[PDB]
């Protein structure tokens, strides 16, 4: 199982936790959560730090959330990048 977290597509999350790097999460709510992965699981539940939530309403909006838990079903996409840099 660890092997599948380590080398499979979830290695994106595994890599973000290890390097304390930022990732953008496109989300079902049409919102995007930008931050660092403290923890994750099979379902893509996550505990996130320094989250910048961004969305639109046209008007763009954002808000800072230091500490939060995301239920993984809401995940559409998870992006790793030269974002942290």
């Amino acid at each position: 199982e660890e092997e599948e977290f380590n080398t499979g597509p979830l290695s994106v999350l595994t890599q973000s936790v290890k390097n304390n790097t930022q990732v953008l999460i496109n989300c079902r709510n049409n919102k995007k959560l930008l931050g660092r992965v403290k923890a994750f699981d099979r379902h893509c539940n996550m505990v996130l730090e320094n989250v910048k939530e961004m969305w639109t309403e046209p008007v763009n909006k954002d808000r800072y959330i230091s500490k939060m838990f995301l239920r993984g079903d809401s995940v559409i996409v998870v992006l790793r990048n030269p974002l942290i840099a």
Partner: protein, 74 residues
């Protein structure tokens, strides 16, 4: 071909340029790095095509399995 199944097809397509359509109509073109048992998908040098038009160049990307409509080699 003599029976070509989902799983091998996808495995043959690893290392290749793919495009994935999502149920929500977004499309993501990039090199398929890997897939897992639940058919979650990892792309590199991803690009986003929405309305079939280049929207955003995104880099390395995880797509949750439940979002996927279909995958195409391209």
């Amino acid at each position: 071909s003599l029976p070509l199944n989902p799983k091998p097809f996808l495995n043959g397509l690893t290392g290749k340029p793919v495009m994935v359509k999502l149920k929500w109509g977004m499309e993501y073109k990039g090199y398929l790095v890997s897939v897992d048992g639940y058919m979650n998908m990892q792309l590199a040098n991803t690009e986003e095509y929405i309305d079939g038009a280049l929207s955003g160049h995104l880099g390395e990307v995880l797509i949750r399995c439940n979002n996927v409509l279909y995958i195409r080699g391209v």
